[PDB]
Design a protein around this ligand. Structure first.
Ligand SMILES: NC(=O)c1ccc[n+]([C@@H]2O[C@H](COP(=O)([O-])OP(=O)(O)OC[C@H]3O[C@@H](n4cnc5c(N)ncnc54)[C@H](OP(=O)(O)O)[C@@H]3O)[C@@H](O)[C@H]2O)c1
Ligand SMILES: NC(=O)c1ccc[n+]([C@@H]2O[C@H](COP(=O)([O-])OP(=O)(O)OC[C@H]3O[C@@H](n4cnc5c(N)ncnc54)[C@H](OP(=O)(O)O)[C@@H]3O)[C@@H](O)[C@H]2O)c1
Ligand SMILES: COc1cc(/C=C/C=O)ccc1O
Lengths: 346, 352
């Protein structure tokens, strides 16, 4: 049994600046046998869904010394988080018909030879695509960032940049449900309005239509900010610092403003601010409890979640690109292949 | 019974910029009564020593929104940290002959109406001047920032800037004795040699003499920096950031390179904070007076056992205080800057 296997490859490395669709290429002639090798310690996956995540951009650029994650290889498939089904296994922990999530290939089928970086999916009542984000890497990020790095108290005043992004939207809800005052910022009036209507943010604003970020935060935060969940960085951070309260905390998840400086750092001393970067890579020990908490929320309908869904691998390169441009409304997902039988969608 | 009471006053609020002598004025006509007001709850001090501290400059500028500390008032005496003797008292916890340290006037005698924010000195055997730095506010800063903010572990690689100053020279010794590798920067060869010889730092470097701070740190930290005790701010900070290890910590104690700039340096590589999982944490010694006792016990014993070294830079007479404060931002001070206002009755102590 030998089948077609479409692939998406890094065409070439790219310099400083912005990725483009043409940095990738779809190849359709390749094939793959539908068993694992004898004597292997591997899992063969039919790839169902793929996440486009902002961090992927970094991996298109060549690094002499190892950044946290290895660079993509020219002529080799793009990889990143996704969800898959075991077509075959020669590793004990995974059986034919199991569903998993983790780093897989941007292709129809992945022979994973490092199976220990996969996680079996225990709730199949939930749409599998959620394990690309809310129940995946993205949710875990929100969860660790917020509960751990921000040390929040019932009553504190929370600001979240890229609030309409996948992490941001989950942070915002965790925080409102913690008894916090929550304000997010975004790139669209469409998204500002989702933050308030769908996601239950107390206020929200479009950063692009604000000529003074510092005064912008002032209107929303008359007594200052306690907790900045930071996805953006740059002049946004300057403005947050200006507006931060005694003993404020900044969780430095990302600085997306910087992928494709700050002048008032000294305010950290006299306001006794804690600024701390964190990486969800270091925190997989918290997954299982994180999983049960967020599963309960969904079943209970105490959390809302929006996915931006694209259909088919060949659509993956533009979706990834749109992500960088803020074209995604909700967590960007690509459907490589839907598993058979069932939700409904509009 | 009335005496002469010299005072240094703030003449005018100043703009963003460097301060100058002529921002303060000496006034020698003033007089003071040597008994607290009747019906008061107060302590009159004869002031013996004053500390020159960098945060003092910020107070010379008007601020519309309150900071941690209140501005100076023009035409009112400058105030800061010092050491005084109780001359008279209508407050029970303070008696005549008691020596104290706290916030006092830049003057010969101060009538303290909030005696609650005074510390009585229990160890009069140690030179009183130490309670302006090592056993005062400054010593506690080193203690809290290093032992608490830095979360150090044996073997860690520690970088301290303004390492030959009041705070840094102490932090380095804490760090050395904690079992850490310790490197400092200072603004001269004199300082550098002090760091290596007197203070036991593993390495030191004259930062004014490095064309590349990033590469300078790379020389001393071939495996990178675990902990950085931030006294300085500015491009040293970025150079540290580039050189910092995974899970590195930065205790933002102060950023003195910035205090006299109308326009502050931008730091450009904060992003590293993410992939290196760094904590950059500011703190204020004012919120930590709770720690004093454990700290005082620990440090008085170190001093008594000569297990910690300490250099003061002494300037004689209240009159030389303005120039001494100004000298801090050019790094004239070599050790902790102290001004001797009036040296207590009873010293029989030699120096060079
Ligand atoms: N540290 C970790 O372990 C970890 C793990 C996962 C994710 N993250 C980080 O969390 C952040 C958001 O993640 P996500 O997956 O939830 O992303 P996302 O929101 O699904 O997508 C990126 C969003 O960022 C905003 N954006 C794009 N370019 C921008 C610019 N130049 N200036 C300001 N905003 C811009 C856009 O929204 P607007 O319409 O709001 O502009 C866009 O929708 C990223 O910084 C990412 O690197 C960190
Ligand atoms: N957060 C708190 O609670 C707290 C409490 C006390 C002190 N502090 C801070 O801790 C730091 C150290 O204070 P200290 O009392 O120990 O002062 P200090 O080091 O005894 O005196 C100041 C020294 O800073 C250095 N310096 C001056 N201008 C500089 C510049 N433009 N660039 C680089 N270095 C410069 C000079 O030494 P060089 O010869 O090396 O240039 C100068 O001798 C200060 O930044 C102060 O604000 C904070
Ligand atoms: C201006 O910020 C500072 C405050 C202090 C004193 C802090 C006491 O808790 C010292 C140096 C500074 O730069």
């Amino acid at each position: 049994v030998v089948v077609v296997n479409k692939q998406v490859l890094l065409k070439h490395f790219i310099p400083e600046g912005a990725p483009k669709e043409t940095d990738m290429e779809l190849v359709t002639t390749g094939t793959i046998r539908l068993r694992v090798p004898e004597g292997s310690n591997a899992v063969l996956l039919k790839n169902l869904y793929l996440s486009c995540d902002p961090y992927m951009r970094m991996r298109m650029t060549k690094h002499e010394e190892a950044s946290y994650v290895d660079d993509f290889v020219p002529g080799a498939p793009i990889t990143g988080f996704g969800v898959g089904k075991v077509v075959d296994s020669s590793h004990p922990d995974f059986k034919t018909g199991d569903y998993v999530w983790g780093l897989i290939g941007w292709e129809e089928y992945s022979l994973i030879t490092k199976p220990q970086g996969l996680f079996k999916i225990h709730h199949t009542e939930i749409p599998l695509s959620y394990y690309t984000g809310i129940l995946g890497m993205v949710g875990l990020t929100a969860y660790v960032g917020f509960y751990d790095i921000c040390s929040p108290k019932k009553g504190e005043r929370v600001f979240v940049s890229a609030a309409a992004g996948a992490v941001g939207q989950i942070v915002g809800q965790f925080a409102k449900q913690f008894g916090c005052y929550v304000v997010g910022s975004a790139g669209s009036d469409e998204k500002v309005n989702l933050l308030k209507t769908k996601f239950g943010f107390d206020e929200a604003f479009n950063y692009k239509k604000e000529p003074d970020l510092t005064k912008a935060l002032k209107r929303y935060f008359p007594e200052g900010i306690d907790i900045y969940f930071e996805n953006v960085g740059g002049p946004m951070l300057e403005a947050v610092l200006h507006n931060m309260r005694i003993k404020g905390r900044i969780a430095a998840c990302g600085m997306i403003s910087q992928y494709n400086g700050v002048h008032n750092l000294f305010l950290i001393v006299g306001k006794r601010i804690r600024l701390e970067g964190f990486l969800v890579f270091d925190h997989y020990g918290s997954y299982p409890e994180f999983e049960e908490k967020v599963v309960q929320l969904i079943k209970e309908e105490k959390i809302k979640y929006l996915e931006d869904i694209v259909e088919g691998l060949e659509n993956a390169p533009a979706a990834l690109i749109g992500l960088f441009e803020g074209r995604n409304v909700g967590k960007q997902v690509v459907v490589v292949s839907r598993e058979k039988g069932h939700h409904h969608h509009h």
